[PDB]
C-alpha cells in the first residue's frame with residue numbers, strides 16, 4: 079500500500095509535474111504527475127472530491143490511477159473535463175486518437191488558435207480494429223484537458239455511426255456530437271444508370287412521393303449564393319432515386335434519438351464514403367428536405383469529386399474541386415450548417431480553398447495521421463521496433479484493404495533491407511508507405527504471439543511513453559501545418 083512512497087520523490091522535485099494541471103475543488107487540490115513512466119493523479123485537501131477519488135492513501139495525499147472511474151469523479155467536480163457542443167457557427171477540428179495518448183499534444187496545438195477541438199473522436203470501425211471502447215476515448219480527452227489546463231471546452235464525437243445500437247450507446251456515454259454515416263443507403267446503381275431507366279425506376283415511386291418532389295423542386299431555380307441551382311426532370315429523378323432512402327434515414331434518426339436526447343447534440347450527417355460523389359445540386363436537395371422537416375444539422379460531409387484517400391493528399395483536378403467546393407459551401411451557408419471534411423488529414427492542396435470558401439466555418443476530421451506521427455517516432459526512436467512492424471504491415475496489407483478504400487502501389491516502397499536505420503522516418507513522408515502503415519493499425523495493435531502477449535503494442539507504448547515530449551512535438555508541428563493552411567487565426 080506504501081509503494082505510494084512515490085509522493086516523497088515528488089516532494090523533492092524529482093518527478094515531472096504538469097505545470098498547467100493544478101485545479102482545485104473546494105478543499106481539495108488536484109494536479110497531474112508522471113512518475114516512473116506512469117502518469118498519476120495527486121490530491122491534497124479534504125472534501126467530496128478527495129473522498130470520491132480512488133487511490134492508496136498516505137499523508138492527506140492520495141495517488142490515483144488515471145482511471146475511467148476517477149475521471150467520472152473529475153467529471154463531477156471539474157466541468158471543463160466534460161464534453162460540450164459548440165454549434166454550427168464556429169471553426170472546429172476533430173482530433174482522432176486511436177491510441178489514447180495523443181490528447182495532450184492535441185490540446186497544445188489548439189491553445190492560442192481560434193478553433194474548437196473535438197478531442198475525443200473515433201469511428202465504430204476504429205473501436206473494432208483497435209479493440210477499444212468509447213469510455214476510453216473520452217477518458218484520454220478529459221485527462222488531456224485536465225493535464226494541460228485547457229478549460230475552454232472540447233467535444234466528443236461518436237464517428238461513423240450506422241446501427242441504432244451505436245447511437246444509443248454514444249448517446250449514453252455523453253458524446254456531444256454524432257455522425258450518422260449514410261453512405262450505404264445511397265443507390266450507387268441509380269447514379270450510374272442511363273436516362274431511360276432512372277425514369278423507369280422513378281416512375282416506379284408513389285404518386286404522392288413523386289408529386290412531392292416535382293411540386294417542390296421541378297423546373298424551379300434556386301439562387302444559393304451567386305449560385306443558381308436548377309432541376310430538370312433528368313436531374314431531379316436521378317437525385318431522388320440516388321438519395322431518397324438515405325434522406326429518410328437521417329430524418330428518422332433525428333426524430334428518434336437526436337431531438338429526444340434531452341441535451342445539446344451536434345448532428346453531423348455524412349456520406350463522404352459513398353461511391354457516388356455528391357453532386358452539388360444533390361447536396362442542395364438533401365439539406366432542403368432535412369431543413370424543411372426541421373432537422374437541426376450541425377454539418378454535412380459530402381463525397382467530393384476526386385478522391386480523399388487515407389494519409390495522402392487530394393487526387394483529382396483541383397480546378398474542378400474548387401468549382402464544386404464553392405457551391406457546396408454556398409449551400410451550407412444558405413442553410414446555416416457547415417461542410418465537414420472527412421479524410422482531411424494531409425489534404426494540403428484543399429485547405430486554403432476550404433478556409434476561404436467557408437470563411438473559416440468548417441469541420442475537418444483527422445485521426446489516422448496522428449497514429450502515423452506516432453509511427454514516425456518509433457522510426458526515429460526504435461528503428462528495430464519500426465522494422466518489425468513495417469514488415470508485418472507488408473504481409474497483411476491485402477487483409478486490411480477490406481476496410482479502407484486505398485489504391486496504394488505496393489511497388490513504391492523501398493524494401494526494408496534497402497533503407498538505413500536513420501532513413502526509416504522518411505517512409506512517413508511517402509504516399510504508399512504512409513497508406514500501408516495507416517490502415518494496418520488494427521492488426522499491429524492486436525498482434526499477439528501464440529504466447530498471447532503483445533507482439534508489438536506494449537513495446538510500442540513504452541517507447542511512446544518514453545519519447546512523449548517528442549510525440550507531442552510532432553503533433554504540434556504536423557497538426558499546425560493543417561491549421562495554418564486552413565487559415566485558423
Ligand SMILES: [Zn+2]
Pocket residue numbers: 237238420421443
Ligand atoms: Zn470519417
